[PDB]
Structure formats: structure tokens, C-alpha cells
Ligand binder design. Structure first.
Ligand SMILES: C[C@H]1O[C@H](O[C@H]2[C@H](O)[C@@H](O)[C@@H](O[C@H]3[C@H](O)[C@@H](O)[C@@H](O[C@H]4[C@H](O)[C@@H](O)[C@@H](O[C@H]5[C@H](O)[C@@H](O)[C@@H](O)O[C@@H]5CO)O[C@@H]4CO)O[C@@H]3CO)O[C@@H]2CO)[C@H](O)[C@@H](O)[C@@H]1N[C@H]1C=C(CO)[C@@H](O)[C@H](O)[C@H]1O
Ligand SMILES: *[C@@H]1O[C@H](CO)[C@@H](O[C@@H]2O[C@H](CO)[C@@H](O)[C@H](O)[C@H]2NC(C)=O)[C@H](O[C@@H]2O[C@@H](C)[C@@H](O)[C@@H](O)[C@@H]2O)[C@H]1NC(C)=O
Ligand SMILES: *[C@@H]1O[C@H](CO)[C@@H](O)[C@H](O)[C@H]1NC(C)=O
Ligand SMILES: *[C@@H]1O[C@H](CO)[C@@H](O)[C@H](O)[C@H]1NC(C)=O
Length: 830
């Protein structure tokens, strides 16, 4: 059949130092299928941290493609080996993870938990079944693990649109960056994230680990419920297991490896407006004016490829978007506390009188094939693609951005079309097994050739690196270069949004779900996708509100702003061939927008703190219910509700004509953020049928949490000048806590040694006859200098009212306290 697998020829754990395991594997027998077997494998197992195990399988006899350390820096590998059945075990005393090598024919290995003896990853073959073997051919790597089908709940392996967050059994997930619209279910999309989270329902419910394959090649991942199998068309096996044991711990461990989420400027949490098709500077000015007139907050105005001179980067349409008017426009935005973001594509038009093209040629920055620059097709027509693996191309990129920024101020950059997208598929190179690989991955759901509508696999990058190997890194690399350009041309914290991504992209950029559609399905689809990118270490995520493609309806757009006002990244965007969909256009949507964006803006200090938490520990802003409630198995399959931070839950209507929603509530007390008198109390988690009128969305806060809020305003800058209102939700079972991070909104290194920041922790507890609310402050200086005052505290979750020396609501007014000054407030019961 497909292969015969490997035997352990030798294996040993180095002793008398930090243990690592080294083994040599030998091919049992050759097979012709999918090409030549690699005869000898080097096999290592090593602990990068007590909570992280690394399994690396390479050709013992040849260097193979690996993601460069410069692209994704990480600890180097453990030495390689020398030139009942037997086993070799690797364990560390402070590690919960135990690795075992089985000297069977073919060989196997497992990783199990010390605490429960539960097997997390099991690559023991079924001897009669080659689909369960490790197979290792030049263009076909096969790695398989069994799974306890009912107990293992898996999440991730992006990027794909799915109706559920938890991965359905019996499917194939393809990772191959492609310009494919996210309104398409199942298909491989713009990004590739070969990570999954595995939550176990038994034996120790809520027990979670992570599994990451550090490989940039195209792959199919087959998940059948009782097994998962990687089928990878190149590179090596570089497998990381993250011990958890909680969901939050897994993401901490994973992002520690791939990079902590980049911080975001405060303004990026404001509302964004964009459209493909804005005709001229007058129109975008008019949109901004109409937002103000509708009294709907607008933070950032975007321009799509319309602004460019005939779709060429680093230029302005001299007729529709003349430089002087654009300068005035951006100046006006800035005077009003607003910001501006333009789009960029990677392809450089081949026009001989275009400065960017001339300079690019001079520094030889473009991707080549057969010794000449590769000629693609995108919006301006013929293009060459910068090789972002080439240091000279990055410098070129920085320089073009500098030049443009010197003439027209910008606040951030949107990088699109960077898979790379190509509108003409090139002919395959005769005889090449790269353009015509032996195993066809399921590209676009049709086994479509990998070179379809992109750069051909035989194209070459700096260092003689093939497109075959580097493809999934293109977007990732451009993001690094663009961020580099921004940091070098402004001392403000940068902001960028990227379409194409790879594992680690979150260290450089925000992301959006791409080309969704104005359909009720896509409204719901935004939630699983939002949650996934949190797992992928990209917490700054959202979808085009009201839908990118196809014309929206009043009701759909109304329900969408309700949901979308809570996306970490909240933007209205649409294609040019559809109806306009600014939020002021319908009264019922505008009224809904004011209500929900009003709450969002009050929650800005909360979002910003969560962003801080994400950069620190990798924990997502928008997170699944089982992150807070991992012991409640009912939450594992929830796909239509989500948390913002630890204790706020959003429960949107996602169907037309509905005025109610059946929403799951985990155990305990929940209070509407829109009406503190409105609450939900259960002794055991269950579904509750919430009232949900056309203009309302259910948003609830759980007992045990404290959230610092500021006032509503038209801009994020204005909001920060409002008083703080503290929301304290008490629990009979636990003291309540909360956190607030404060800085200047633009410090390059968030929470760094520079000291331009303050951290406040809040604490509240009831006694039999008193109630204490207090704070602790780290680095009091910055916050004090900003004059932030807390004037009111609202207390939920008690059945008795409290004051200074069913549920009730208590309010403490005219407090005038300074946020920067630690306090202790004593209240008494009535
Ligand atoms: C504005 C955006 O324009 C482009 O994207 C467009 C396409 O150009 C357009 O044709 C269309 O494409 C859709 C199809 O309509 C839809 O049917 C689906 O195609 C599927 C197909 O259904 C499915 O069967 C499968 O086809 C296989 C088949 O399985 C197999 O057996 C065999 O037959 O082969 C076929 C074909 O390979 O897969 C198809 C997908 O490949 O989905 C496609 C979308 O992929 O709509 C899209 C989306 O609008 C550009 O590509 C986009 O990049 C562009 N959007 C960007 C541009 C901007 C402007 O600057 C910016 O505003 C946007 O934000 C940005 O995203
Ligand atoms: C090279 O870039 C030039 C600058 O943008 C292009 O010329 C401009 O084309 C606009 C329409 O695309 C037109 O409104 C502008 O007036 C014009 N500006 C100037 C200074 O010529 C040029 O476009 C080519 O030449 C024009 C005359 C048309 O024939 C276009 O169809 C051509 O593409 C660009 N040339 C190429 C080869 O890309
Ligand atoms: C707040 O909720 C309570 C209970 O659900 C309800 O009786 C009251 O009318 C609501 N108030 C407003 C202003 O909606
Ligand atoms: C609450 O506790 C404080 C300190 O323990 C005490 O001084 C005070 O008398 C108490 N209040 C009441 C109403 O008993």
C-alpha cells in the first residue's frame, strides 16, 4: 500500500543533564507510492519547558525545509542520535507529560499525563493498517493519532468557515493559503494555523492540552472522531504538545512559542467604517459627517483601492483623491480625534514610469521563476511580487512606506491580497514534482492544483527557497515587514490588518474574517471564526459587519451591529457592487447602533485591559464559554454565544423575524448590562429563553466580577476623559475581582520598564455585616497624571442594599476618588 513504516534502530535518553531522547529510525521496506521513502529518520523528544514537549522527526541524512528561525524564533533542536515490546521513556519530575517510544514494527510513540495517566497523543500504529503509520516521503508526511472519540473535543486547524466552533467528526481540513471567500464553508481560506486545542470531558473534565505542527507546507488534516491524521506535502515533523492543563494555560504555552499577541492602540477598539467603491474625497467626508449627524461613534475612516492612482500602491488618484484634499481630510480627522487607514496590496504594477516599480527593480526585490521576475495579475494589471524573505525587499518596503507617509499622514495600514493572490494561473513547469505534487491536497474542496490563482510552486525566494515551501508564510512575512515600516516611521504604537496569515501572525497584526456575505449564516459564522483566531494567538479579530458580499437587509444589518459592536475589531465594510450599508441609513439600525456602541465605548477600558492580558499571557479577548467554565461540558459545543473577558456573556439573535433567544447560562447569577434589574439565576446551567426585541441584544455579567467602565463619547479619546464607574457583581461563593490596565495608548512596549502605565486590581467581599471594596495599584504615577476619577460604584448580586457608614441594586455616588490612589471602602448592610 502507501508505506511500510519505520523501526527503531537505536534509542537513548541522554543522562546526567536535562533529559532529551534521541533515536534513529530505519525504513522497514520501500514503496513507490507518492514517491521515494526517506531511508533513515532522526527522531528526538525534548522538554522545552516543563509544560511543553517537542517531537522532531527529520531526515537523518539530509537537511530539509524548516520555517527559518529568523521568521519564527525558537529554541534549537536537541542533539541527534549516533550512527512485551521494548520501550524508551522520557520524563521530567516537574513535567506532567510523559513520552514513550515503542520499539514495535512499525514503531510508535505516545504522550500521556502523569496526573490522570490519560493518553493525550497516541501514534501507536495498527499493524494491519498503513493509514495509522508514520510515513515519511519527500513530498508526503503522514502522522496519525488515535483519540477517545466521545471524550476529546477539538478546536482549531484554521482557516475555515464552519457552523460550529468544536470540530465536527468525519471531515478533511486543508491548510493552504488561498484567495477563497469566507462565505464558503469548509474550504481552505486565507490563512493556515496547524494548531488544535483538545478539551477532555472525562476522566478529569476540563482537562486541556494543545498540539501544534510547526510546518508551513500544504496539508490535509483528517479528523474522524477516533483519529486525527496529518498529510503534509513537504517539510518536517516538528510537533509541540502543550500541557495545559486549563484552556488558558494552553494558549499561554502556545503563544510563548509562536509569539505574544501584538498590542493594539486604544483607538483600534473604536468603530471602523470602510467600503470598496467610495468614489472620491467628498464622499468619504460626507460619510463622516453623516455619522456625526446620526450621533453614532466613528473612530476610523478607511479607504479601499479607490484612493490609488489606477490601483497602484503609494499613489493617489489625482482626480478623485487629490493629495491636497486628502491632506486636508486627514488633518480634519485628526483635529476631531479620529484616524485614517488606507489599504495596500503586495503586487507592484510593472509600469515603467512608476517610482515604486523602478526602485524595486534596482534593488532586485521581486520573486523569480526560471530566473526572471514572476509576472502575476491583480488590480492594476501586470505585477511583480516583492520577496519578503529577501532583506533587500523588506528595506525597499520600508522605504516606499516612508515616502508615502511623508506626503500623506496615516494611522495604520491594511494589507490585502497577500496569499499571494494572482488572477491568472501559470502553466506548470514540465517535469516538476513541485508544480505537480504526488499527493494532491484538497485545495478549494476539489483537489485543485496548489498553483491555482497564486504564485507557482517552482518560483524562488532569497536563499534559493521555493514557493512550494514558503507559500503559507507570504502574508506572515509581509506583516513583519509592514510593521517594521510603521515602527521606523512613527513613534506611535502601530496598527495593521492582514488578510493572509500563518501561526505567529498575531505578534504582528490584526485579522478579519475576509469576504463574508450578507446572509444570516455568515452572521453566525463570525462567532466560531472569532473564537478560533483567539486560539491562534490573534485576539484582534472581527468580521465585516452587515456582510461584505451581496446586499444586506435592514433586519440583518440591525442584528449584525448588535453582535458586531462586541467584536474585538469592529468594522463595517462592503463590496462596491452591493447596496450601501452605513449605520445611519436605517433608523432602527442607527438606534440599535447607538445603544450597542454606547455600551462598547463604556467598555473600552475593559477591552483595553483584555488586550493587555492577551499580550501578557496569550489569553483571548473574545473567548469561548468553556474558558471560564471548563467543568461544564454543555459549554463545549456552544457556537452562538461567547464571552468578552472572564465574566461578560453575549447572546445574539441570529435568525430573521425572531424576538427571543434560547441561550445557555452556566451556573450562578447573571445580570443584564443594559438593565441591572434584569437577571438570570440558575442552580445548574441550562438554556433560558431571553426576551430579545428588534433593538436589543442580551449581554450579561456573571457574579464574582468587577469591571471598570467609563462614559459614552463620540471618540475613544473623548471617552478616556470621562469619569470611571465601577461595576461590582457580588457572589455568595467567592470574593469578586477585576483588573484595569492603563497607559498612554501608544507606548511601543506595553507594560514595559518605561513606566508610562498603571495597573489597578479591584477586590470586593461581603461579611455578615459589612462589605469591603478595595484597590491595589502598581506604578501609581501615570494614572495619577491623567487625573482619572471614580465617582460611582454600582453593586449587583446581593439581596440586601448597602451604603457608606430577589436581588437588589445598590449605588454609591459622589465618590470623587482618584483611580491612581489605592483605596479601601467600607459599606454596611441595611
Ligand atoms: C472583491 C473580491 O473579489 C474577488 O473574489 C470574488 C471572486 O472573483 C468571484 O468570482 C466570487 O468567487 C466565489 C464564487 O462565486 C463562489 O461560487 C465560490 O467559488 C467556489 C465554488 O463554489 C466551489 O465549487 C469551488 O470551485 C471548485 C470546485 O470545487 C472544483 O470541483 C473545481 O470545479 O474547481 C472549482 C474552482 O476552482 O471553489 C470555488 C472557490 O475557489 O467562492 C468564490 C470565492 O473564492 O466571489 C469572490 C469573493 O468576492 C477576489 O478574489 C477577492 O480577493 C476580493 N476581495 C478583496 C478585495 C478588496 C478590494 O480591494 C477588499 O475590499 C476586500 O475586503 C478583499 O477581501
Ligand atoms: C503608467 O502609469 C500612468 C500613471 O497612472 C498611467 O497613465 C494614466 O492612466 C490613467 C488611466 O489608467 C489616466 O486617467 C491618466 O490620465 C494617465 N496619466 C498619465 C500621466 O498618462 C499609464 O496608463 C497608460 O497610458 C494611458 C494613456 C492609457 O493608455 C492606459 O490604458 C495605459 O495603461 C500607465 N501605463 C501602463 C503601461 O501601465
Ligand atoms: C428593567 O428590567 C426590569 C425587569 O426585567 C423591567 O421590569 C424594567 O421595566 C426594565 N427597565 C427598563 C428601563 O427597561
Ligand atoms: C462593620 O465592621 C467594622 C470593622 O470590623 C466595624 O467597626 C463596624 O461596627 C461594623 N458595622 C456594623 C454595622 O456592625
Amino acid at each position: 500500500a502507501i508505506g511500510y513504516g519505520y523501526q527503531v534502530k537505536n534509542a537513548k535518553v541522554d543522562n546526567s543533564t536535562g533529559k532529551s531522547l534521541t533515536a534513529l529510525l530505519q525504513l522497514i521496506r520501500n514503496s513507490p507510492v507518492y514517491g521515494p521513502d526517506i531511508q533513515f529518520l532522526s527522531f528526538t523528544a525534548s522538554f522545552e519547558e516543563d509544560d511543553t514537549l517537542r517531537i522532531r522527526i527529520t531526515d537523518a541524512n539530509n537537511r530539509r525545509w524548516e520555517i527559518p528561525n529568523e521568521v519564527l524564533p525558537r529554541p534549537p533542536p536537541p542533539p541527534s542520535p549516533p550512527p512485551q515490546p521494548t520501550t524508551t521513556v522520557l520524563s521530567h519530575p516537574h513535567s506532567d507529560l510523559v513520552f514513550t517510544l515503542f520499539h514495535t514494527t512499525p514503531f510508535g510513540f505516545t504522550i500521556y499525563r502523569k496526573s490522570t495517566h490519560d493518553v493525550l497523543f497516541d501514534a501507536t500504529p495498527i499493524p494491519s493498517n498503513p493509514t495509522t503509520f508514520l510515513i515519511y516521503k519527500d513530498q508526503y508526511l503522514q502522522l496519525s493519532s488515535s483519540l477517545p472519540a466521545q471524550q476529546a473535543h477539538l478546536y482549531g486547524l484554521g482557516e475555515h468557515t464552519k457552523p460550529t466552533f468544536q470540530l465536527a467528526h468525519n471531515q478533511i481540513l486543508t491548510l493552504w493559503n488561498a484567495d477563497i471567500a469566507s462565505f464558503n464553508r469548509d474550504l481552505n481560506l486565507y490563512g493556515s494555523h496547524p494548531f488544535y486545542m483538545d478539551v477532555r470531558s472525562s476522566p478529569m473534565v476540563g482537562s486541556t492540552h494543545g498540539v501544534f505542527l510547526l510546518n508551513s507546507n500544504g496539508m490535509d488534516v483528517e479528523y474522524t472522531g477516533d483519529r486525527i491524521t496529518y498529510k503534509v506535502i513537504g517539510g518536517i515533523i516538528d510537533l509541540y504538545i502543550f500541557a495545559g492543563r486549563t484552556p488558558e494555560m494552553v494558549l499561554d504555552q502556545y503563544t510563548k512559542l509562536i509569539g505574544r499577541p501584538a498590542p493594539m492602540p486604544y483607538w483600534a477598539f473604536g468603530f471602523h467604517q470602510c467600503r470598496w467603491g467610495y468614489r472620491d474625497v467628498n464622499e468619504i467626508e460626507t460619510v463622516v459627517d453623516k455619522y456625526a449627524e446620526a450621533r453614532i461613534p466613528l473612530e476610523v475612516m478607511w479607504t479601499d483601492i479607490d484612493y490609488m492612482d489606477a490601483f497602484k500602491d503609494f499613489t493617489l488618484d489625482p482626480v478623485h483623491f487629490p493629495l491636497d484634499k486628502m491632506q486636508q481630510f486627514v488633518t480634519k480627522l485628526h483635529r476631531n480625534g479620529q484616524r485614517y487607514v488606507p489599504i495596500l496590496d503586495p503586487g507592484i504594477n510593472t509600469n515603467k514610469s512608476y517610482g515604486t516599480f523602478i526602485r524595486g527593480m534596482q534593488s532586485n526585490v521581486f520573486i523569480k521563476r526560471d530566473g526572471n521576475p514572476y509576472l502575476g495579475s491583480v488590480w492594476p494589471g501586470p505585477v511583480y511580487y516583492p520577496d519578503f524573505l529577501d532583506p533587500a525587499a523588506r528595506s525597499f518596503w520600508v522605504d516606499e512606506i516612508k515616502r508615502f507617509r511623508d506626503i500623506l499622514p496615516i494611522d495604520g495600514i491594511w494589507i490585502d491580497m497577500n496569499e499571494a493572490s494572482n488572477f491568472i494561473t501559470s502553466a506548470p513547469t514540465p517535469g516538476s514534482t513541485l508544480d505537480n505534487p504526488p499527493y494532491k491536497i484538497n485545495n478549494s474542496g476539489g483537489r485543485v492544483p496548489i498553483n491555482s490563482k497564486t504564485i507557482p510552486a517552482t518560483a524562488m525566494h532569497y536563499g534559493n527557497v521555493t514557493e512550494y515551501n514558503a507559500h503559507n508564510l507570504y502574508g506572515f512575512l509581509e506583516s513583519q515587514a509592514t510593521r517594521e515600516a510603521l515602527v521606523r516611521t512613527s513613534n506611535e504604537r502601530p496598527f495593521l490588518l492582514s488578510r493572509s496569515t500563518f501561526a505567529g501572525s498575531g505578534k504582528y497584526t490584526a485579522h478579519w474574517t475576509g469576504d463574508n456575505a450578507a446572509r444570516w449564516d455568515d452572521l453566525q459564522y463570525s462567532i466560531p471564526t472569532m473564537l478560533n483566531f483567539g486560539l491562534f494567538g490573534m485576539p484582534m479579530i472581527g468580521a465585516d459587519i452587515c456582510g461584505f458580499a451581496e446586499s444586506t437587509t435592514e433586519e440583518l444589518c440591525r442584528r449584525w451591529i448588535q453582535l458586531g459592536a462586541f467584536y474585538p475589531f469592529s468594522r463595517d465594510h462592503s463590496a462596491r457592487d452591493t447596496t450601501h450599508q452605513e449605520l445611519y441609513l436605517w433608523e432602527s439600525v442607527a438606534a440599535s447602533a447607538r445603544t450597542v456602541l454606547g455600551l462598547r465605548y463604556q467598555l473600552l477600558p475593559y477591552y483595553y485591559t483584555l488586550m493587555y492580558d492577551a499580550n501578557l499571557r496569550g489569553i483571548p479577548i473574545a473567548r469561548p464559554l468553556f474558558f471560564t467554565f471548563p467543568d461544564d461540558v454543555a459549554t463545549y459545543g456552544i457556537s452562538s454565544q461567547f464571552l468578552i473577558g472572564r465574566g461578560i456573556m453575549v447572546s445574539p439573535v441570529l435568525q430573521p423575524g425572531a424576538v427571543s433567544v434560547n441561550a445557555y447560562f452556566p451556573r450562578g447569577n447573571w445580570f443584564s448590562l443594559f438593565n441591572y434589574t434584569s437577571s438570570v439565576s440558575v442552580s445548574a446551567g441550562t438554556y433560558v429563553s431571553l426576551s430579545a426585541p428588534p433593538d436589543h441584544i442580551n449581554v450579561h455579567i456573571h457574579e464574582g466580577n468587577i469591571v471598570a467602565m467609563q462614559g459614552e463619547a463620540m471618540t475613544t479619546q473623548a471617552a478616556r476623559s470621562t469619569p470611571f464607574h465601577l461595576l461590582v457583581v457580588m457572589s455568595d461563593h467567592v470574593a469578586s475581582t477585576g483588573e484595569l490596565f492603563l497607559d498612554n495608548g501608544i507606548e511601543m512596549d506595553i507594560g514595559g520598564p518605561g513606566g508610562k502605565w498603571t495597573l489597578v486590581r479591584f477586590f470586593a467581599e461581603s461579611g455578615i455585616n459589612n462589605l469591603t471594596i478595595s484597590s491595589e495599584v502598581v506604578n501609581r504615577g501615570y494614572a495619577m497624571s491623567q487625573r482619572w476619577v471614580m465617582d460611582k460604584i454600582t453593586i449587583l448580586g446581593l439581596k440586601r442594599r448597602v451604603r457608606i457608614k430577589g436581588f437588589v441594586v445598590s449605588v454609591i455616588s459622589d465618590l470623587r476618588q482618584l483611580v491612581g490612589q489605592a483605596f479601601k471602602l467600607e459599606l454596611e448592610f441595611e
